[PDB]
Amino acid sequence: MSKGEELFTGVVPILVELDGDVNGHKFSVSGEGEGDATYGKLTLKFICTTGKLPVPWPTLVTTFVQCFARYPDHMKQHDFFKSAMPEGYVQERTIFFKDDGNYKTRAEVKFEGDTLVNRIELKGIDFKEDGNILGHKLEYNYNSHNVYIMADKQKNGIKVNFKIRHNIEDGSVQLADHYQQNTPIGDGPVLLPDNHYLSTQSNLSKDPNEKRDHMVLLEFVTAAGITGSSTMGQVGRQLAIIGDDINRRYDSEFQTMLQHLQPTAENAYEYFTKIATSLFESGINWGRVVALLGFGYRLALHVYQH
Amino acid sequence: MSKGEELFTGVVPILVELDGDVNGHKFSVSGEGEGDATYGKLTLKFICTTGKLPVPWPTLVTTFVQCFARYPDHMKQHDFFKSAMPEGYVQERTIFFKDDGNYKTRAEVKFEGDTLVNRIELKGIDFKEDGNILGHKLEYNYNSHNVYIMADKQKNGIKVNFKIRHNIEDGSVQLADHYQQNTPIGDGPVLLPDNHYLSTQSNLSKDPNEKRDHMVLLEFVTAAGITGSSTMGQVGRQLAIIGDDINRRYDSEFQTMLQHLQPTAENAYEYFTKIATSLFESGINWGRVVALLGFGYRLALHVYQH
Numbered sequence: 001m002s003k004g005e006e007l008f009t010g011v012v013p014i015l016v017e018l019d020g021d022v023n024g025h026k027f028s029v030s031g032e033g034e035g036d037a038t039y040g041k042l043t044l045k046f047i048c049t050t051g052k053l054p055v056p057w058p059t060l061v062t063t064f065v066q067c068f069a070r071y072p073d074h075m076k077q078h079d080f081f082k083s084a085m086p087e088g089y090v091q092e093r094t095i096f097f098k099d100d101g102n103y104k105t106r107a108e109v110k111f112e113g114d115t116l117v118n119r120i121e122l123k124g125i126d127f128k129e130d131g132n133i134l135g136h137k138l139e140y141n142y143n144s145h146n147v148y149i150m151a152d153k154q155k156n157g158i159k160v161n162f163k164i165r166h167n168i169e170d171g172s173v174q175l176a177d178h179y180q181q182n183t184p185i186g187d188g189p190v191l192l193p194d195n196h197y198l199s200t201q202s203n204l205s206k207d208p209n210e211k212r213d214h215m216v217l218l219e220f221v222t223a224a225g226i227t228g229s230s231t232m233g234q235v236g237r238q239l240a241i242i243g244d245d246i247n248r249r250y251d252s253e254f255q256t257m258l259q260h261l262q263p264t265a266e267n268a269y270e271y272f273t274k275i276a277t278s279l280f281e282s283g284i285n286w287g288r289v290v291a292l293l294g295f296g297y298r299l300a301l302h303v304y305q306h
Numbered sequence: 307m308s309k310g311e312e313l314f315t316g317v318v319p320i321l322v323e324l325d326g327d328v329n330g331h332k333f334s335v336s337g338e339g340e341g342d343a344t345y346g347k348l349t350l351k352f353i354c355t356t357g358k359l360p361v362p363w364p365t366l367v368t369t370f371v372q373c374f375a376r377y378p379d380h381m382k383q384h385d386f387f388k389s390a391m392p393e394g395y396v397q398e399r400t401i402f403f404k405d406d407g408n409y410k411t412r413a414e415v416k417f418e419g420d421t422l423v424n425r426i427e428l429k430g431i432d433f434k435e436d437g438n439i440l441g442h443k444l445e446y447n448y449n450s451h452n453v454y455i456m457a458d459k460q461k462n463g464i465k466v467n468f469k470i471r472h473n474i475e476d477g478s479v480q481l482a483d484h485y486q487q488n489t490p491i492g493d494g495p496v497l498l499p500d501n502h503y504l505s506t507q508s509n510l511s512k513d514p515n516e517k518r519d520h521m522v523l524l525e526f527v528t529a530a531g532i533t534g535s536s537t538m539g540q541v542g543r544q545l546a547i548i549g550d551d552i553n554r555r556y557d558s559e560f561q562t563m564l565q566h567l568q569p570t571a572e573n574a575y576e577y578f579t580k581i582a583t584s585l586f587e588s589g590i591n592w593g594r595v596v597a598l599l600g601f602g603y604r605l606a607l608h609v610y611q612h
C-alpha cells in the first residue's frame with residue numbers, strides 16, 4: 001500500500017475548473033462534488049459559466065478523478081492514483097472521435113488543503129460542423145466501460161486506454177478512442193501497477209433548480225481484472241470436491257469400459273475418434289465433452305500401462 | 307455357460323405355428339426348418355395355410371428363434387435364450403409401423419422331444435388401407451440389423467429392441483419399431499446378460515416347386531458387443547448418458563466459477579496453473595484430473611471467444 005491511500009479513507013470534497021477551445025469556440029466550466037473512494041462513488045455537478053456549452057456534455061464526461069476508484073484489498077498495491085497524492089499527478093489525454101475531430105487535454109490533480117482539485121485545459125480541433133459533436137447529435141446518457149491500465153516505468157507513471165461508445169440519436173454509435181497518460185507531480189515514490197482496469201458506471205442527469213447549462217454526473221468506479229489468491233484457492237477446492245465425486249461415481253465405470261474395449265497403442269487414436277463421433281452425433285454439450293475427456297485420459301492411462 | 311446350451315450343439319429341427327389377425331383379416335401360417343446355433347444359421351420355409359397372406363411376407367420376418375444365435379465362446383454366459391431351454395421362454399413384441407398400424411405378438415418357444423417349437427398369435431390394428439402394409443408395397447427383400455439386448459432383472463428375463471428398415475417399391479422406406487421382452491417359462495436359473503447385440507442377416511426367396519403362398523427364409527445370427535471393437539457403440543451411448551448427467555449436475559457451477567474468476571486472455575494460463583496447484587495440494591486421482599480438464603475446456607472457450 002501507500003501513504004496517499006490514507007487521504008481517501010473518508011469523503012473528500014472536489015473542485016473542478018476547465019478552460020476549453022473546440023474549433024475556436026471558448027468556454028469555461030466549474031464543478032463541485034464529493035468523492036468516496038471507500039465505496040468507489042463519485043458525485044459531481046458542472047455549470048458552464050460562459051453561456052451555452054458548444055459541445056455535447058457527454059463528450060466531456062471522461063474529462064470531468066480516478067483517484068476515487070475503489071481498489072479491492074488484494075489489488076491495493078496497484079493504486080497509482082492515490083499513491084501519487086497529495087502532491088498529485090498530471091493527466092494528459094488525446095481523444096480521437098471516429099470520422100471527426102479530436103480533443104487534447106492536460107489536467108493537474110492534487111490536494112489543496114482538504115480539497116481535491118482538478119484543473120483542466122481542453123483544445124479540440126478538426127470537428128465537422130455537420131458532425132456528431134458540433135452537430136449535437138449525441139444522446140444524454142452514458143454506457144459502462146473498462147479503463148485499461150498499464151505501468152509506464154520509463155515515465156514513472158501509467159499508460160491508459162479505452163474506447164468510449166456514445167449513443168447517437170438515430171440508433172448508431174459514435175466512437176471516441178482515449179489515449180491517456182498520468183505522471184506524478186511529487187518526487188516521492190508512487191506505486192506501479194500490474195495490468196488491470198477500472199470498471200466504470202456513469203449516469204447523467206439535471207438539477208431541476210439550475211438556470212445555467214449544466215450536468216449532474218454520478219459515477220461508480222471499481223478496480224478489477226486481477227483475481228486474488230483467495231479466489232483461485234477457492235475454485236481449486238471446489239474442483240477437488242467435484243473431482244472426488246466424479247471419481248467415486250464413475251472411475252470404475254470408465255475402467256471397465258477400457259477393459260472391455262482392449263485398446264492397443266496402434267488403435268487408440270482411431271478408437272477414440274470413432275467413439276467421439278457416435279457420442280457427438282446425438283449432440284454436444286459441456287458435460288459430454290468432459291466425459292469424452294475423462295475417457296481419453298483413462299484411455300491413455302490404459303495404453304501407457306501394460 | 308448353462309445346461310440348455312447343450313441342446314443346441316448339433317442341428318435342431320424347427321416347427322412354427324402362427325395365428326394372425328390384421329384389421330380383421332384372419333390367416334394361418336405353418337413353418338418348418340432347422341437351426342444350427344454352432345454356426346449361427348437358420349433355415350425356414352413358411353406356408354400360408356389359408357390362402358393369400360393378407361400382409362406382405364417381409365413384415366412377418368422378425369416374428370418367424372434367437373436361441374440359434376451363435377454366441378462366441380467368450381460370451382456364452384450372456385446367452386439368455388439357450389439358458390432358458392428346454393422349459394422355454396415367452397417372447398412378446400409390439401411392432402410399430404411408422405405412420406401406420408402395429409403388430410402385437412405373443413410366442414412360446416420350447417422343446418418338445420427333439421424339436422424346437424414356436425407357437426404364435428399376432429394382432430394388428432389401425433393399419434391404413436392403402437398404406438404400405440395392406441397395400442402390399444414392400445419389396446421382397448431384407449436389410450441387416452442389430453438386435454440390442456439388455457437384462458430385465460425384475461422380470462428375470464431380457465428387454466430387447468431394434469428398428470427394421472423395409473424397402474418400399476416406390477423408393478421410400480417403411481420403419482418398423484420393435485419392442486420386445488423375453489420371459490423364462492421354467493423355474494430353473496437363467497442367465498441374465500450384460501448389454502450386447504445380435505447381428506442378423508436375412509435372405510428371402512421362393513421354392514420353385516411350391517404353389518402355395520410362401521416364404522423361404524435364411525438367417526445368419528451372431529452375438530457381439532461385449533468385448534473389443536464391437537463395444538464402441540455402447541461406450542458412446544454410455545458416455546452420452548454420463549455426459550448428460552455431468553452437465554445437469556455441474557454445468558452451472560463451472561459457469562459461476564469462470565464468471566467470478568474473470569480471466570482475461572492474457573492471464574488465462576496463469577490462473578489455470580495456480581488453480582491446478584491448489585486442487586492437487588489435497589491429492590490427485592482420475593476424477594480430479596477430469597474436473598481440471600473440464601474447467602480448462604470451459605476456460606479456453608470463455609477466452610477464445612472474447
Ligand SMILES: C[As](C)(=O)[O-]
Binds near residue numbers: 280281282283284
Ligand atoms: C452436435 As452434431 C451437429 O455433430 O450432431
